Design a protein around this ligand. Sequence first.
Ligand SMILES: CC1=N[C@H](C(=O)O)CCN1
Ligand SMILES: [Mg+2]
Ligand SMILES: [Mg+2]
Ligand SMILES: [Mg+2]
Ligand SMILES: [Mg+2]
Length: 306
Amino acid sequence: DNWRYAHEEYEGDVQDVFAQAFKGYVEDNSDHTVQVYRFGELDIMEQTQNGILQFVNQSPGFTGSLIPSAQIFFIPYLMPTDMDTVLEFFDESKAINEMFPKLYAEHGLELLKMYPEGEMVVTADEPITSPEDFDNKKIRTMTNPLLAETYKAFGATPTPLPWGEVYGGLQTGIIDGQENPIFWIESGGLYEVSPNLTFTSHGWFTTAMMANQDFYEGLSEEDQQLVQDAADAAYDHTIEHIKGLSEESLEKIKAASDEVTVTRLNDEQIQAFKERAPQVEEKFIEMTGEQGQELLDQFKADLKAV
Ligand SMILES: CC1=N[C@H](C(=O)O)CCN1
Ligand SMILES: [Mg+2]
Ligand SMILES: [Mg+2]
Ligand SMILES: [Mg+2]
Ligand SMILES: [Mg+2]
C-alpha cells in the first residue's frame, strides 16, 4: 500500500529528517511505500482527520486550537532548558507517553510520537532583554490561543499568523519579530529580515506525529507493529540529528550575516519573564478544566522526576 504523510517543514529540516527515517524503515521492512509531502506540497490536519492523509506531523502550536490540552507546551518556563533533560522527559513522561495519546484519540488521531526540535529563540528588530522591550512589538506566533496569551503576558502584541506569511511580514514591518528554533531561523533565512536573536530560555519547539486512527486501526497487527517500529527508528534518528544542531545552525547564521546580534538573558533577566508565567498557567487550566489540571500535574511530576 501507499501511505501519504504530510509535515510542516522543508527538505532537510528536523520534521523531514523524522519523516524520511520513518519512510526508510517502512520501505526497508515491507512492500509499502510512504509518500512524504513537505510544507506547501498539498489544511493537513483536516486532510488527515477526513482520511485523505494517513500520517501527519503537526506541532502543538497549531494543534492547540483543536486539542486544547496541546497548549501545555506554551506555558513559559515549564520545560527544562538543556537538551539532555528534555530528552529524558520525552522518553519517560507519562504525560507525553500515556496521557497525550488518549487526548489525541478523542479527535480521531493515533499519536505515534512527540519529540522536541529545538529551543525557542526570539528574533526581532531589536534585542529583547526585558518584558518592557516587547511593548508595542507585533510578534508573530503559531495559531493557538494560549501562545497568544503568553506573548501578551510578556508585553507583546501577538500577531498569530500561519507560517507562509512570516518572512514577508518581517520584511515589510507587518510584524516586528517571531519565535522559532535556531535551525529554522537559519534554514528559512529569517535572520536576514529579523537579525536580533534573543535566547529567553522560555521553551522548546516541539512536535507530534500521528496517524488517522481509523486507518491505523484497520491495519493488520503486523502493519501496526511496523508503524510503531518505524516511529521508534525515526525518533532515534531524529534525536541524533538534533544533537549539536542549534550550535551548528548559529555558526551558519554568524557566517552568513554580520548584522546578526545575539542576546542571552542572564538569570535576573530570565526571572523577570518567569514572573509572567503563572497567569499563563491559570489561563491554561481555565481553558482545559479538571482534565487540564490532571495533565499539568503529571507534566510537572514528570519534570521533577528528571
Ligand atoms: C520550526 C517550525 N516552525 C513553523 C512555524 O513557526 O509556523 C512550523 C514548522 N516548524
Ligand atoms: Mg521599546
Ligand atoms: Mg500597546
Ligand atoms: Mg567564530
Ligand atoms: Mg558574507
